[PDB]
Amino acid sequence: GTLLGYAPGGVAIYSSDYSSLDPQEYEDDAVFRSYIDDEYMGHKWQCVEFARRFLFLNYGVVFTDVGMAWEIFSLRFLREVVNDNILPLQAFPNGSPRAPVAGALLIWDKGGEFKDTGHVAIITQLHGNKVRIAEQNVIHSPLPQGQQWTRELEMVVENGCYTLKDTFDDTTILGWMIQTEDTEYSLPQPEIAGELLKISGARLENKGQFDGKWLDEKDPLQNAYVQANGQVINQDPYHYYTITESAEQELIKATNELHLMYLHATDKVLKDDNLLALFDIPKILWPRLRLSWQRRRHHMITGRMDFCMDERGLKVYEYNADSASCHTEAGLILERWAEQGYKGNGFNPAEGLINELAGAWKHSRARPFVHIMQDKDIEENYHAQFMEQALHQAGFETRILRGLDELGWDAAGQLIDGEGRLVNCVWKTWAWETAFDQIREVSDREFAAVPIRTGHPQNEVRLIDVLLRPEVLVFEPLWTVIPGNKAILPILWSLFPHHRYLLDTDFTVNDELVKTGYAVKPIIDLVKNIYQQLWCLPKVDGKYIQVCTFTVGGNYGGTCLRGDESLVIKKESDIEPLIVVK
Amino acid sequence: FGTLLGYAPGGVAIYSSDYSSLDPQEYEDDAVFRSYIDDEYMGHKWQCVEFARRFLFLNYGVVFTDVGMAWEIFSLRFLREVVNDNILPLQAFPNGSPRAPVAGALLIWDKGGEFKDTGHVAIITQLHGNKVRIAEQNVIHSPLPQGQQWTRELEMVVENGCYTLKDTFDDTTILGWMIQTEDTEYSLPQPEIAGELLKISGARLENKGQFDGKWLDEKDPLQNAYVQANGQVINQDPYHYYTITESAEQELIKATNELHLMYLHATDKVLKDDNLLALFDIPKILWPRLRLSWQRRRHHMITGRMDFCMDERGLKVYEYNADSASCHTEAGLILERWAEQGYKGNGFNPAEGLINELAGAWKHSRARPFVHIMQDKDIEENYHAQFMEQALHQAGFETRILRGLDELGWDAAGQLIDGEGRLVNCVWKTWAWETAFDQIREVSDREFAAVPIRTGHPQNEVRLIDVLLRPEVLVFEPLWTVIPGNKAILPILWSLFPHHRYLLDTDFTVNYAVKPKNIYQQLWCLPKVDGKYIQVCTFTVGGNYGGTCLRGDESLVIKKESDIEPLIVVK
């Protein structure tokens, strides 16, 4: 790219002339990711990337990384990065009585000059009747000296209403967005047609594509997967499901927003002992759990959100931020599946998974050498190996520890592995709860802190002795156990009452819950517990399908489907092949 | 020395502190004896106070003011939550209290017996029935038995609802325990220092002509720069000096640490509300960047200076300059010269550790390997810049001093560079932030989305604001440090800690000096001591105490030109 100049605040404007590139460079997709310290801004040097980066550097906020600029007009919040605050963002149509202001996002719908993507610019200066903007991927030649705008648009005020005129004539300006609590004159948030949220069944032409060994056993990752499952993804590989590109766009927005909503709920829980007590976490760990949250809220690498998605809308059921899995099936096995038998133009929405994980690890505070800790269990073998691939791609060295036998302490009481190498950075497949169970009887009135071992007769190291060791940096962080506990659903609801992605939930039976019908779930019959309005999964080609999204560093990492003949998906229920289509 | 004896609960290591085996001169000053966890100073290896701060830190994320001797811990009434700097109430209960000791409590010994002058501190690690197990450093000196995570067990007697603990030594005095709780029932009222000990005294040296010639070295660049700005002078009569008691210094150490946190809380309140913030006269265009600075760099302040009124009536802070504080050179170097050249008593200059405290702060900062020092073309700024450069060098940083803005330019990519073409990306400035603010005071936040700083110019003319507000430049002190030194913060401070012993009643309305929309504060004038009004000033370094110095003037109001006065702390 080329530096064209700077918008106010010292924000660089670049040319995204992919032309001057050869396909050999474009093989490493890390060179296209624009970052400011460890915060992903976007793709060099797109319009969306300039807008996030400008808002980030000048105000410390960003907005959900939607695939196309016209999509921004449907967002109703900006994310304050340092504390993850959700700030209200309003939309105003061109011709609005709400005049455009300095710093507003100016959005173009698709069409004309901005054909299929629409566009975004930042309004940088109000020069009387002209509206100066800065933007990327429109101008590609250096700007005059000292000019800190890319284009100037004329604004007309007639009858208390404001109308901007583009410099192009076949385009359509949707309007401007202002971060404010005032909703006067604002557009109500667009609602996706329910029909586009329907999950459809599909069938491949059966030419025996999957009759033999379609996963390669020689690839240790795929063979490890085969050792735990066989040459199998689902019961009938010729059957798969599709969702619309619009549904995926909605899943991408919901994933990002819900992540921030869960962090707010987690913070509300952690600030009140009466709420925290509902999560069944040993009191003795409370100070460390709180400590973890205060300093590592941004250190979560990956999680998984499960939804109910059909013509009625999108509803979250759960968010496992601690021990999420299914990454291998969705990011690797489904790719081989598509390769082997799919020939349409759609795509597997979890295709970008590995790359996204690598970026998270590269921009984390992990140590150079990461010990991967898994249980001696065949499914965990491939999950651990899939993550090891992402770690290596990001530049880390690793050692996989199966069970706890090779761990011991050195003469100074520091944990070491089998090669006598100090252990101080762990990525685990173990659920934290497994570690909690080892000290569930340690009273916080008797002990000042957890009496973990630092030496032992038979050099016997327990899981809890490594995870709670101050010198060991653990992923996922301790605080991640909060999100997945159903005790948080009533809290999430009180913080965002009647949110389009939430289900009415409470600790008591409301009058809303009686009229609506509700499920009683223990901290599971249908009608101390939580009560939630009923909202069962759609049944599609003989199975109840649940839509799942992966979060990676708090952002969307892809989507996959889980299906079952029962109305209740279990951890053993199958991943089903998913293809996103136009 | 430093032998690992075992661990207390939570994985906290217990080390033996056998100094003997080596140098005295170096145990103190060498950075190798300062215990840290990541970037947070824990203590002196491997003392009792150090183990208590680190135990509390690693296990709960909290610490307590780093007082000189264990027994003084008993007088503290709060713990500091490190991440957010919250002030947590801390209560003290005497031995024999109806308030029982809890696991995690600080157990303090007064001086006396086995704990001679220092007193002692331990943490209560386990309540095993009628025993109380503790962990501590600087008592045991042999490894503990395998798997034992306490250094001593002590018997507790429960007679009539009152708990009394018995020590294992028999010539000692256990003051009691401290618990972090908001419940004050059965708790000790915070000790008040007798006013007499807070008096500043005048004293004189035996005049043998020690100051007749050049007592400052003009061959030393730093000392010569000081002389070029002042002559061979520290004050008007170098045979005259002042003293304060070790007890007063102890009081100034505590107050300094507490007041820094209190000012951080008032800063937060200010930044959380536009109504409050508008009172500080900071260009509104700068507001989002100022808040970002506060949010991300609260722990990044390097050094500041608090000015107090101190005498028999108490200790009262007047101001905290967290942006452009000076006097470090006079207090940390010139007074060292002065004492050396003419003082022959047993006391010490309380700002003697200033240079080393600053070096530590820089070493533990996020400053970049190469730091440009930016100063204006002003004679007193020359020596302040060089004093700070010396601390940066000591901490491992490379530097280059920029005087005025002329050598600064932009390369082809519009990035800032110095006269040698090196990229400028980390600056420590002697310039006050307000000087830069002034350059963009007319930039409206209604017309411009952000500050229209230059990234190029017809005559390659770089302004101070074009550097300090550049995203790629990491500036010290951070932009938020402009808030503590503004008088408009005094009423906020008061509202947050009403009737606090170190504050002066101040409000925007009259509840009585009037300071310029006005602030009204209770009258409270500086004491006159040997012909001058004397102000007591402490340096903060990384939020911690870095020393004390005195400033005096014939007038009741000390000015920046006011003289630093030789200061000795004595028993």
Residue B10 and residue A82: Cβ atoms within 8 Å?
Answer: no
User: Which residues have C-beta within 8 Å of that of residue A369, sequence separation ≥ 6?
Assistant: A396, A397, A398, A399, A421, A425
What is the side-by-side strand order in the sheet with A525-526?
Answer: A505-506, A529-533, A518-522, A525-526
Q: How many CB atoms lie within 10 A of CB A240?
A: 26
Cβ A196 vs Cβ A243: under 8 Å:
no
Give the DSSP per-residue string, A14-59: EE--GGG--TTGGG-TTTTEEEETTEEEEETT-HHHHHHHHHHHHH
Residue A447 and residue B288: Cβ atoms within 8 Å?
Answer: no
H/E stretch holding B126:
strand B120-126
A1-185 CATH choice from 3.30.43.10, 3.30.1330.10, 3.90.1720.10, 3.90.1150.10: 3.90.1720.10
Hey, which residues does B400 pair with through a beta bridge?
B372
Give the DSSP per-residue string, A49-112: HHHHHHHHHHHSEE----SSGGGGGG--EEEETTTTEEEE-EEEETTBSS---TT-EEEE-SBT
Cβ A334 vs Cβ A350: under 8 Å:
yes
Residue B515's nearest CA partner among B319, B270, B321 is B319
Cα-based distances in Å from B452 to A125, B255, B288, B303: 10, 42, 14, 30
Backbone angles phi, psi at B331, to 5 degrees: -75, -40
H/E stretch holding B177:
strand B174-179
- Find tokens 């020393």 and name the residue: B547
Question: What's the CA gap between B63 and B79, in Å, rounded?
Answer: 6
Q: How far is B465 from chain A (nearest CA, A)?
A: 11
Q: How many CB atoms lie within 10 A of CB A277?
A: 14
Residue A187's nearest CA partner among A85, A101, A72, A103 is A72
Question: What's the CA gap between A543 and A235, in Å, rounded?
Answer: 11
Residue B380 marked in a binding site = yes
**A295 in reach of chain B (CB within 8 A):** yes
Residues of A in contact with B9 (CB under 8 A): 447-452
Give the DSSP per-residue string, B46-78: T-HHHHHHHHHHHHHSEE----SSGGGGGG--E
Q: What's the alpha-carbon Rg for chain A, to the nearest Å?
A: 26
In one letter, which amino acid is B420?
Answer: E
Q: How far is A464 from chain B (nearest CA, A)?
A: 11
In one letter, which amino acid is A441?
Answer: E
Question: What's the CA gap between B313 and B297, in Å, rounded?
Answer: 36
Strands A105-108 and A173-178: antiparallel
Cα-based distances in Å from A447 to A276, A283, A327, B176: 20, 11, 39, 19
**B143 in reach of chain A (CB within 8 A):** no
Residue A232's nearest CA partner among A336, A361, A153 is A336
Residue B263's nearest CA partner among B321, B179, B195 is B321
DSSP 8-state assignment for residue B123: E
In one letter, which amino acid is A142?
Answer: P
User: Which residues have C-beta within 8 Å of that of residue A186, sequence separation ≥ 6?
Assistant: A90, A91, A92, A98
Classify domain B1-186 by CATH number. 3.90.1720.10
CA angle A552, A366, A409 (to 5 degrees): 130
Hey, which residues does B551 pair with through a beta bridge?
B535, B564
Cα-based distances in Å from A116 to A74, A112, A540, B391: 17, 9, 32, 58
* CA A314, chain centre distance (Å): 16
Cβ B535 vs Cβ B545: under 8 Å:
no
Residue B147 and residue A456: Cβ atoms within 8 Å?
Answer: yes
Collapse the DSSP code of B387 into the 3-class scheme (helix H, G, I; strand E, B; otherwise coil) and give the result. Answer: helix
Which structure tokens are listed for B437?
A: 């603010």
Residue A447 and residue B289: Cβ atoms within 8 Å?
Answer: no
Residues of B in contact with A176 (CB under 8 A): none
Strands A130-134 and A151-157: antiparallel
Residue A10 and residue B445: Cβ atoms within 8 Å?
Answer: no
Residue of A nearest to B104 (CA): A448
Cβ A321 vs Cβ A476: under 8 Å:
yes
**Of B296, B414, B470, which has the smallest distance from its Cβ to A82's Cβ?**
B296
Which residues of A define the annotated binding site? Answer: 46, 52, 66-69, 137, 304-306, 318, 320, 323, 379-380, 434, 486, 521, 532-535, 546, 567-569, 574
| Angle between the N-to-C axes of helices A488-495 and A245-270, in degrees from 0 to 180, rounded to the nearest 10 | 100
Resolution, expressed in angstroms to one decimal = 2.2
Residue B296 and residue A5: Cβ atoms within 8 Å?
Answer: no
User: Which residues have C-beta within 8 Å of that of residue A368, sequence separation ≥ 6?
Assistant: A396, A397
**A509 in reach of chain B (CB within 8 A):** no
Backbone angles phi, psi at A256, to 5 degrees: -60, -50
**A82 in reach of chain B (CB within 8 A):** yes
Residue B13 and residue A60: Cβ atoms within 8 Å?
Answer: no
Interface of A with B in 331-360 (CB under 8 A): none
Residues of A in contact with B102 (CB under 8 A): 445
Strands B174-179 and B106-109: antiparallel
Residue A446 and residue B10: Cβ atoms within 8 Å?
Answer: no
Q: How far is B69 from chain A (nearest CA, A)?
A: 24
| Angle between the N-to-C axes of helices A378-394 and A220-229, in degrees from 0 to 180, rounded to the nearest 10 | 160
Cα-based distances in Å from A312 to A192, A261, B157: 10, 21, 68
**Of B12, B147, B451, which has the smallest distance from its Cβ to A455's Cβ?**
B147
CA angle B522, B482, A55 (to 5 degrees): 135
Q: How many CB atoms lie within 10 A of CB B206?
A: 8
**A308 in reach of chain B (CB within 8 A):** no
**Of B449, B454, B456, which has the smallest distance from its Cβ to A103's Cβ?**
B449
Domains of chain B, residue spans? 1-186, 187-571
Which structure tokens are listed for B87?
A: 């002030």
Interface of B with A in 427-486 (CB under 8 A): 445-458, 469-472
Residue A449 and residue B12: Cβ atoms within 8 Å?
Answer: yes
**B2 in reach of chain A (CB within 8 A):** no
Q: How far is A78 from chain B (nearest CA, A)?
A: 14
Strands B303-311 and B314-321: antiparallel
**3-state per-residue secondary structure call for A319-387:** EECCCCCCHHHHHHHHHHHHHHHCCCCCECCCCCHHHHHHHHHHCCCCCCEEEEEECCCHHHHHHHHHH
Residue A102 and residue B445: Cβ atoms within 8 Å?
Answer: yes
Task: Single out the catalytic residue among B48, B309, B327, B537.
Answer: B48
Residue B125's nearest CA partner among A277, A452, A280 is A452
Residue B446 and residue A126: Cβ atoms within 8 Å?
Answer: yes
Catalytic positions of A are 47
Half-sphere exposure of A405 (CA within 13 A, CB side): 4
Question: What's the CA gap between A451 and B12, in Å, rounded?
Answer: 10
User: If you count residue pairs, one on A and one on B, with CB atoms under 8 Å apart, how many are there?
Assistant: 145
Residue A484's nearest CA partner among A516, A512, A535, A523 is A523
Interface of B with A in 373-412 (CB under 8 A): none
Question: What's the CA gap between B375 and A503, in Å, rounded?
Answer: 60
Hey, which residues does B534 pair with through a beta bridge?
B552
Residue B103 and residue A58: Cβ atoms within 8 Å?
Answer: no
Backbone angles phi, psi at A186, to 5 degrees: -75, 150
Experimental method: X-ray
In sequence order, which ranges of A395-507 are alpha helices (DSSP H)?
A: 432-436, 463-467, 488-495
Residue A508's nearest CA partner among A492, A530, A539, A480 is A530
Q: How far is A261 from chain B (nearest CA, A)?
A: 21
Prior bond to B150 cis, omega within 30? no
| Angle between the N-to-C axes of helices B246-272 and B287-297, in degrees from 0 to 180, rounded to the nearest 10 | 130
Residues of A in contact with B450 (CB under 8 A): 7-9, 11, 58-59, 103, 124
**A180 in reach of chain B (CB within 8 A):** no
Strands A239-244 and A578-581: parallel
**A122 in reach of chain B (CB within 8 A):** yes
> Please, what is the end-to-end C-alpha distance for chain A in angstroms?
31
- Find tokens 């003051």 and name the residue: B175
